[PDB]
Design a protein around this ligand. Structure first.
Ligand SMILES: NC(=O)c1ccc[n+]([C@@H]2O[C@H](COP(=O)([O-])OP(=O)(O)OC[C@H]3O[C@@H](n4cnc5c(N)ncnc54)[C@H](O)[C@@H]3O)[C@@H](O)[C@H]2O)c1
Ligand SMILES: NC(=O)c1ccc[n+]([C@@H]2O[C@H](COP(=O)([O-])OP(=O)(O)OC[C@H]3O[C@@H](n4cnc5c(N)ncnc54)[C@H](O)[C@@H]3O)[C@@H](O)[C@H]2O)c1
Ligand SMILES: CC(C)[C@H](C(=O)O)[C@@H](O)C(=O)O
Ligand SMILES: CC(C)[C@H](C(=O)O)[C@@H](O)C(=O)O
Ligand SMILES: [K+]
Ligand SMILES: [Mn+2]
Ligand SMILES: [Mn+2]
Lengths: 349, 345
């Protein structure tokens, strides 16, 4: 034991794609002597049914004591209509908030030679390599007042200066290690909170003169991200806009089953697919495990500094996608078979 | 046929003049008795009256039967504070006329599949109508404000605001393919939960219309991967704004998308697109959105359905024949407009 991991499989396809990532981690552990140890803990729907709440105390303790969390998606029709304070999705929010993981990193990269897998023509998809840095613990997701009566409902989009500054800082540090361009995304032409966001990111950027800074309104950014995506490096934005733009960015490599994420901040870092619990395909052994696998690759790199191992996983996934694509990308490889293709390539390298 | 023309800033006057030439040729051929006046709006109005929506412009709008609007904004006024900027005049126009229903159609015209960046088999038969709630939500909700330490805005909806925009979407679907998808973020936000429940209630009044829900992040992906499966898409102010820019990738360019804003007061017809300051002055701006917006005015404000269709057919032919630069072609604004007219005649 010198790599300590909390595994939180979730609901629907969550446990299916998470098991696939685990077989990749185990294969790497044995091949490399990583000294991996992990414990599995209930989370989401599975936790509501067993403990009455989505993020129970033994799961919080497992999270606190691990060096990293490999997380599966939560949610489904089974839990429709729960009091909000115990919904599977509120447990996910609590996870994020209790560890103060304010920086959500969502990369979208179109692998050379896989441009054809996109719904868009190859010239738009070619070369795409974008990093969305989404503010994860603030904005409308956590703001108060919030509630609902018979006549109306209300939620508050709000940000303070230090919340914007700390996410902006992460996006500049990231850009400095990439291609030194940040686009900051807001609705400053309509909303006081966008004006505030913009001005604060402008101030932070004065601390990073080596990084080019551009602003776009969220509606134009959505259009640009599908017409000119190759022209973007880092994209920094608030909680809700980052959620929308990151599901949108899946159309670049061509499916939502491809996109990984890392959530970083004060406590235990969390690695998880962008995608949800996909109840329409759960139980059919077809869910694309690429997001989960690449999330384990982000864990290797960011939580454990194992950059070269992360790159080997990524390359093994890109070859498996070219060779035996899963059904969401027009191919026939189920979860188990795709995962075996990834392992074969790993072992060959 | 009495019309207020509000040309706006950047490409706004350029594409608006193009739509006017189409309207004039139509007036002569058809004897519409068109009568229009031009009013200052946006930056052009800030510079001449110190405000983006001045009194003679409000009076022009009140007294017209329809407004043909040009886009507003640009770097020139970036240094004004928001509350007096060109975009706040747009919001005031909408609010004063209580135009709560914004109609933004995204169609791949039969034959123009090649113009879309989507593979042809994804783009075939795509015909989506976004119905966006225009006068409520975070755009207008109180409290809103800003201090040195923080800023806030309120995403707020009341039951009647949701019911009336839901009705409009159900009526529109009943005349189309009888499917509505309603979009929210009900899994995180009380206001989405409330939107969803109220749309469900209104839908019980339209058993001929199928009703589906999507969360806004999945909707954005589905609108690009499987656009052919949507008819009407109903949503709140900010989600509607984002989804409808995104929807431009279906026919192929933002410069193609028209809009109508309908409600209590004078109806407003205008491109989805903004003032495009990065191309203003170059004679290249695609005027299709402005021309198709004039077509929507003909249909929705004047009941001239077959004329609208004729405008739309001439645009489609011109697009196939002399495409503007945003669609991989070389036809500038004047030349593209001339192609439209030749097909009209
Ligand atoms: N981090 C999370 O736990 C997370 C994230 C998003 C949504 N959710 C929850 O998941 C449930 C489903 O919500 P949704 O449908 O809007 O989002 P979703 O991401 O689960 O699925 C959206 C679409 O993509 C497809 N898809 C998703 N992952 C895939 C994969 N790995 N392989 C192949 N296809 C895949 C799904 O079938 C569906 O068509 C809801 O209960 C929602 O609250 C959870
Ligand atoms: N209804 C409106 O008045 C309205 C709507 C949106 C934006 N705006 C304002 O427009 C200005 C620029 O905003 P923006 O860049 O975020 O969005 P935009 O819609 O003005 O331009 C977006 C992109 O698409 C291009 N584009 C837009 N219309 C085009 C056309 N007819 N032909 C060819 N290309 C076109 C532009 O060159 C730019 O690359 C800002 O001041 C903004 O507030 C106004
Ligand atoms: C399940 C929900 C809380 C979540 C979010 O909006 O953050 C999900 O959509 C995601 O993208 O991770
Ligand atoms: C300019 C702005 C106020 C407007 C909106 O967000 O409604 C524009 O983006 C649009 O899409 O019409
Ligand atoms: K650590
Ligand atoms: Mn999401
Ligand atoms: Mn817009």
């Amino acid at each position: 034991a010198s790599m300590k991991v909390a595994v939180l499989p979730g609901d629907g396809i969550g446990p299916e794609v998470t098991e696939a990532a685990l077989k990749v981690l185990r294969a790497l552990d044995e091949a490399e002597g990583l000294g991996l140890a992990y414990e599995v803990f209930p989370f989401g729907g599975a936790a509501i049914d067993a403990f009455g709440e989505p993020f129970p105390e033994p799961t919080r303790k497992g999270v606190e004591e691990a060096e990293a969390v490999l997380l599966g998606s939560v949610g489904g029709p089974k839990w429709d209509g729960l009091p909000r304070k115990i919904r599977p999705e509120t447990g996910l929010l609590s996870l994020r908030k209790s560890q103060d993981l304010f920086a959500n990193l969502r990369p979208a990269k179109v692998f050379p030679g896989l441009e054809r897998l996109s719904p868009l023509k190859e010239e738009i998809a070619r070369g795409v390599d974008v990093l969305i840095v989404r503010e994860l613990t603030g904005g409308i997701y956590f703001g108060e007042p919030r509630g609902m009566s018979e006549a109306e409902a209300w939620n508050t989009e709000r940000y303070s200066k230090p919340e914007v500054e700390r996410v902006a800082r992460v996006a500049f540090e990231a850009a400095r290690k990439r291609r030194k361009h940040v686009v900051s995304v807001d609705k400053a032409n309509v909303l006081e909170v966008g004006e505030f966001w913009r001005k604060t990111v402008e101030e932070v950027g004065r601390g990073y003169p080596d990084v080019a800074l551009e602003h776009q309104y969220v509606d134009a950014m959505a259009m640009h991200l599908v017409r000119s995506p190759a022209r973007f490096d880092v994209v920094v934005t608030g909680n809700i806009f980052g959620d929308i733009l990151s599901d949108l960015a899946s159309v670049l490599p061509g499916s939502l089953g491809l996109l990984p994420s890392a959530s970083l901040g004060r406590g235990t870092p969390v690695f998880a697919p962008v995608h949800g619990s996909a109840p329409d395909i759960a139980g059919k052994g077809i869910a694309n495990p690429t997001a989960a696998i690449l999330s384990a690759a982000m864990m290797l790199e960011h939580a454990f500094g194992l950059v070269e191992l992360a790159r080997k996983v990524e390359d093994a996934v890109a070859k498996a996608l070219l060779e035996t694509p899963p059904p969401d990308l027009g191919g026939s490889a189920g979860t188990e078979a795709f995962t075996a293709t990834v392992l074969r390539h790993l072992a060959a390298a």
